[PDB]
Design a binder for this molecule. Sequence first.
Ligand SMILES: [Cl-]
Ligand SMILES: [Cl-]
Ligand SMILES: [Cl-]
Ligand SMILES: [Cl-]
Ligand SMILES: [Cl-]
Ligand SMILES: [Cl-]
Ligand SMILES: [Cl-]
Ligand SMILES: [Cl-]
Ligand code: NA
Ligand code: NA
Ligand code: NA
Ligand code: NA
Lengths: 296, 296, 296, 296
Amino acid sequence: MVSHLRGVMPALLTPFDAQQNIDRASLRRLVRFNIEQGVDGVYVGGSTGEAFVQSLSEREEVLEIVAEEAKGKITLIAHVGCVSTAESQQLAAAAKRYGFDAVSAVTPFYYPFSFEEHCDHYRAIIDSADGIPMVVYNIPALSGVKLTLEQINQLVTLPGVGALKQTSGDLYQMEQIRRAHPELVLYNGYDEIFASGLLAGADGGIGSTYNIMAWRYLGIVQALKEGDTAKAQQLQHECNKVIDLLVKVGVFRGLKTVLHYMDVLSVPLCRKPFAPVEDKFQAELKALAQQLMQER
Amino acid sequence: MVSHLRGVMPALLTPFDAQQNIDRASLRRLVRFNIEQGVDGVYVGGSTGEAFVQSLSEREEVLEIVAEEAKGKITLIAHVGCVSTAESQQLAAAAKRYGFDAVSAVTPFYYPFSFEEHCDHYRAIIDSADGIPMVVYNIPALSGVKLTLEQINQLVTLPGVGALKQTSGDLYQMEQIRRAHPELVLYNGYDEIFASGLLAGADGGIGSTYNIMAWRYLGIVQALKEGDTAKAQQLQHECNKVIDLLVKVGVFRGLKTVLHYMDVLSVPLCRKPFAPVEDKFQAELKALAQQLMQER
Amino acid sequence: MVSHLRGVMPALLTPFDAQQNIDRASLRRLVRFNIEQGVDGVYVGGSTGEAFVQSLSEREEVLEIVAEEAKGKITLIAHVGCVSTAESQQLAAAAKRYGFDAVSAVTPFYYPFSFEEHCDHYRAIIDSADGIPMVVYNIPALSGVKLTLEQINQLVTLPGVGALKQTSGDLYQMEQIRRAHPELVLYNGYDEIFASGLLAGADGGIGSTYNIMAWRYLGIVQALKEGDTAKAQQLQHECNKVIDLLVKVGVFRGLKTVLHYMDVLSVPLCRKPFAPVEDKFQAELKALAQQLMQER
Amino acid sequence: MVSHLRGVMPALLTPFDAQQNIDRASLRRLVRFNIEQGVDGVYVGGSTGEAFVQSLSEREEVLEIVAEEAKGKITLIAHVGCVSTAESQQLAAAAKRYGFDAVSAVTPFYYPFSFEEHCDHYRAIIDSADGIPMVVYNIPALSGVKLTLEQINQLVTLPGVGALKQTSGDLYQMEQIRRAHPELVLYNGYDEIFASGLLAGADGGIGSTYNIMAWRYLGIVQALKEGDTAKAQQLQHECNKVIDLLVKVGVFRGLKTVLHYMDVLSVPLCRKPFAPVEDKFQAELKALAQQLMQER
Ligand SMILES: [Cl-]
Ligand SMILES: [Cl-]
Ligand SMILES: [Cl-]
Ligand SMILES: [Cl-]
Ligand SMILES: [Cl-]
Ligand SMILES: [Cl-]
Ligand SMILES: [Cl-]
Ligand SMILES: [Cl-]
Ligand code: NA
Ligand code: NA
Ligand code: NA
Ligand code: NA
C-alpha cells in the first residue's frame, strides 16, 4: 500500500543566496525544474539538501516551500532526521502539516547508539508523522553506523516503515534485502552504481545528481525494463563521467554550479565550511551544463 | 602565553530534567561540585555535554550559566563547534561575551571537508572569538576525520590556536606532537589511558569521567611528577574499573546516574535517542557513588 | 591479443585426502567435472585453492596435474602469487613449463609494500613467465592492499599484463576501469554480485562457487547478452541462496562437501586451521547437491 | 612458572647475502651483538625476521643457528607461526629439538578463521612444542585479526600458554589484560610507545628496533622502576626520533643498514619485494650508526 513511493526522486539541493541565506526564489525554480524532468518524487531536506548546516526552522521553511510548489503533482518525501529524536519529531509533525507523503530519517550519528535505541528513535518519529510512512535511510559511509542484514530486516518491518533508502555499495546486501522483502520500496543511494543497483534489487533511486540529469536515470530504468543491457551501460557510463567531474570539484557545489549555468539557480554557493568552486573548474562545469541542455 | 590553559578539566555534562529540558539548578550544582574537586578548568558544551542534541540557543544558555557560576574561579573553555561555520561563530561570539577564557571546536563532521576547508573553519571561529584562544579538538573515532601529523602541525600553529585536545589512543602521535611542539598545551582525551598519555607527552586532560572522580586524575598527575610509577598505575587501574562499568551501562547516563547518587544532579537522564539506564545496573552505580564519596 | 582469456572460470579447489595430503585422483576428477560444465577456463592455485596453506612444491604439483588433464581443452591460468617475489617467480617458471596460458599473482600482503615495490614484483614475475600474460589479482578485503584507480591503471598497462581479477564490491570502480580500458579482460571476483558486476563492466568472472554451479553463471552471461533482465536476476537470486548457505557453513569446505555429495571429491576436507563442517549442516549440503544435480 | 620469560627481547632480523640467500656468518654475529647489549632474550623467526618470505627449511635453519649461538646464555623464543597449523607444528617440533625456551605463533591470517579455529590452532602447536610454553602474538594491524578482550582472556588461559605478545597501540586494552592477569608475561609490541606501554601494564617488550639500541629500552625499564619519569620520556623521545627515520626509509632495511654501518651485518638487504634503501638516505643512516656507537 506504498507502491506509490517507488521510483526515481532527486535528493533536492537547498539553494543559498550570496550571504548563505536560503534563496527562496531559486528553491521554487529548482522544484519546478525537477518536476518538469518527469521525476516520480522529490526528497527534501536530506544530506544533499545541506540539512546538517541548517537550523530546524530553516529546514521547516524548506519543507513548506517545496510542498507549496509540488504537493499533488509529485510524491514528496521529507527527510526529518536529526541526531535528536525530539528534533526529528518536530520536523515529522511539520512535514505532516505541510502535506508530505512520507518522512525519512538518517540513522542518528556521532554518538554510538544501540540498535534498540535506533528502533525506538524510528518508532517515535513514526508516531509524530501521524500516519504517513517512514523511509529508513542507510548511509554507513557518512553516518558511521554499520547495520547487519538482520537489523535492516527488523527496521523495514517496524510498523509505519514503508521503504528503505539503501545508500550502500554492497550489492550482495541489496540482493539479500530484495529477496527477503519482495514488496519493499528499495531506493538505490549511490548514483554511480544505479544500473547495477537496480539489477541487484532496487526498484528506484534517490540521488543528488538526478537534479541535473534525471532523464538519464529514467532512461536506465526504461532500458533495463526493455532488456537493453547495452543502453543501460552506456547511460551509466555518461552519468559516471559526470560524477567523476563532480567528485573532483566538490559534489554539492558542482551540482549547484551546473544548475546555475542551466539558469535554474541564481547563486550556486554551499554553506561554510564548504568552499566555493575553484575558478579553474568553471569552464568544464559550464560546458557540461551546455551539453546537458542540448541532450534534452 | 596560554600556559594558564594547562591542566585537568572535566568535560561538563548537561543535566536535563524529567522532560528532557535543561535542569538549570542541577547544572549550577554540577559546576560548583567540579570546582570543589580542585580541577583546573571546566570544558563546556562538548560532545560529553550532549551538544549535538541541543539547539544553539540551548548551548548558549548552558555557556552563560556556567560562566555565571565559574568565571574568575577556574578556567572556562567553551566548545563552540558545529558542522556549520556560521553556527560555530555565533557560539564563539557568545562565549566571548560571557567571559570564557578559550573556545574549542570539533573538526566539522558528517560531510567530507578538505583540510584547507577545516583550516578556514578554524580561522573564521578564531576571528569571532575576538581574542580568546582556540583549542583544536581531535576525536577521529567519533568525527570520522583522520588528520595526519603534518596537518595537526599546521592546525596548532594557526594564529589564535593555543591548545590541542587530543582524543586519540595513538601515543606515538602524542609523543610526536609533543616533540614537535614543546610548549603546546596538549590535552589527553581518553580517560582510560590518562597516565600513559601524560607519559607520552600530554600535559593535562579533558575528560567526561573527571566529573565523578577528578581527584584520581589529579593524583595521577601528582604521582608522575613525584616519580611514583606504581601509584599512577594503581590510580589508573581504579579509574578503568569505573570506566569498564560506565561502558557497560552507557557512559554519559552512567556518569549522570553516579552524580545523582552523589546528590549532585536531581535527574540523571540523557536526551533521546539515549535510553535510560537499565534497572539491573542501578545497584552497581549506587554502590560506586558510595565508594567514591567515602574515598574522598 | 588476449581476448582468449575472457570468460567464466572456476577458482579451482585443491582436494585433500583424510590426512590433509593432496588427493590427486579427486583433483583430476574435479578438473574434468569443471570442463564438462562448459567453463571457459580454470584458475589454479588461487586463494580458493588453499594456496597459502601449501608449500611451493605442493603448488607446483597441483599446477602440473591440472595442466595434464586440461591443457588444450580449456584456458589454464596459474595463480603463482606469494609474498616473496622469488617464490612467485619459481611458480611462474613452472607454470610456463607446464603449458599454462597465463599466470596471476595476488598483490603481496602481510608486509606493507610501496606501489613501486608492487609494480617491480609484477615485472619480475612477468619476466619469469617467459611470454605468457599476467593477470593482476585485486582482493583488498583479504590482502589489506587498497589500491587507487590510478594505481590500477598503471598495473594493467604494465608490459605483459593481460587482465585484471577485480575481487572488489565497488562497482563504481569496476565501471571506471572498464571506461578507461575498453579492451581489458576484467574478471568479476565476488560471485554474489556477478550479474551486477557484468553490468558494471566486467566481461567474465573467476569464482569459487562456479565449481558447483557454473551453468548458472554462464546463464547470467547469456541472459544479459540476450537482454533478459529478469532471468539474470532470478539466476543471481538462486546463486545467492547458495552463497548464503556456504557462508554459514564455511565457503571452501561447504563447496568441497557439495562436490563430495555430487561424487566429484572423495574427501571434502580443508587443511587446518579450517575445521571440518559441523554435522548439523550436512543434510542441507546434501540436499543442495541433489538439487543442483537435478537442475542440470 | 614462566617469569623467566619476562623482559626486553629483540625481534631478530634475518640477514641475507647479496643474492637474497641467508647470510649465516652475519646471523651469528647479530645474535652475539644482541647478547652483548644485555638483552633478556631473543625472538627468532617473527615478522621482523622476514619469516613470511622464507621457506620452512630456511626458518628451521635460522632457529638452529640461533640456538647454537645463544642457548643457555639468554632466553630463546621461536616464532613458529604460519597460516598452516601443520607447518607451524613442524617448526614447533624443530624449536623443541633445538632447545628453545618458548614458541610463539601469530594469529593465522589471510583466510578468516573462527575464534575456535584459532584456539585449536594454538592447541595443536602447543602439543607439538612438547612442553615448552607458547606466546600468543597479537598484531591486528598486519594480521587483520581483531580479537576482543574476552577472546584474549581465553587464549592466555589455554593450557601451555605462558605469555602474550601485545602488538597493539590500545593501552586501555593493555591495562585491562594486566588487571585481569596480574602474573601474565605481557610484551609490548610497538617500540614507539614502549614507555607508555610499560606504564599501562606490559612487563617487557619484543621489538625490531631493539637490534640497534636495546640499551635505551633497558634504560626506560630502569627509569620507570626508579621513578625517573622525565628520563623515561627523554629516552622514548630519542627512540622515536630513530623510529621516525626508520619509517621514512623502510623499517627492516633501515635497521639492517644501521647494523651494517655498525659492522654487525655484512650486507643489509631485505628479500624482494622489499626494495633496497634509497641512496639519498644513506648519509642519515650512517650518521645514526655513528651516533649510536658513541652513545654506548
Ligand atoms: Cl539540522
Ligand atoms: Cl559522523
Ligand atoms: Cl548543536
Ligand atoms: Cl550535528
Ligand atoms: Cl604458498
Ligand atoms: Cl594479511
Ligand atoms: Cl613461512
Ligand atoms: Cl604466508
Ligand atoms: Na510518484
Ligand atoms: Na586553571
Ligand atoms: Na577459454
Ligand atoms: Na632471560
